[PDB]
Each structure stands twice: as structure tokens, then as C-alpha cells.
Amino acid sequence: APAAPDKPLEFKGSQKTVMFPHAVHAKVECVTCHHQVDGKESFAKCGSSGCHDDLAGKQGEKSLYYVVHTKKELKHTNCIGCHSKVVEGKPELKKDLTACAKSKCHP
């Protein structure tokens, strides 16, 4: 598989840009986020054509917003989902990892 990016990268929606750092997630297997597609590995951008390419809508499988933010139980692990589990044991990180404003995702 390709190498994991060294520097934080721009993970964009239609209005906001969130800096995503791989370094901090080094203990997380790649596939956790870069889920398999049709039985094969995939490292394409989440919102590329044919994937979660609805960058404005907030509901549905095609919605990038939805797969990133929903707390519902999904087929694959997502951003808010794992962060919520993490803060159950580390409450001191609740604001930094799950808050809608003033968090590490949305400063």
C-alpha cells in the first residue's frame, strides 16, 4: 500500500477544511478508515466521484458530512464514532475530540 502522508492534510467539505493528521493515528490500522471496497483495498479520497461525493448534503451514504459525523452504528468505523469511544475513558478529551466548535477538528 502507499505510504501514510507525513504532514497534516486538508480534508475538505464544501465549506470547511479540517486538518487531518496521520501521525496521531499511527496505532490505528489503515483499513479502519480506508475501508475496503468490493473486497479490495482503497486509498482514494473519501469524497471523490462515485464515493461520498455529495459534499453539501448531510444525510445518506453519499454524504461526506454524514459518514464523518454520525454517531449511528455504521458498517465501518468513522471519525465521531471512534472519538466518542475514546472520550468515554478519557473525559478530559471530550472537547478536543468531539465538540462541534473549539475542538481540534473545528478550532
Residues binding ligand HEM (CB under 6 A): 1-2, 4-5, 9, 11-16, 18, 20-22, 24-25, 28, 30, 32-35, 37, 42-48, 50-52, 55-56, 61, 64-65, 67-69, 74-80, 82-83, 86, 93, 97-98, 100, 103-106
Q: Is the dihedral of CA 49, 52, 55, 58 positive or negative?
A: positive
Upper half-sphere CA count for residue 88 (Cβ side, 13 Å) = 6
What 3-state DSSP class applies to 1? coil
Q: How far is the CB of 58 from ligand HEM (least distance, A)?
A: 8
Query: Which cell is 11 given?
Result: 480534508
Residue with smaller CB distance to ligand HEM, 15 or 91: 15
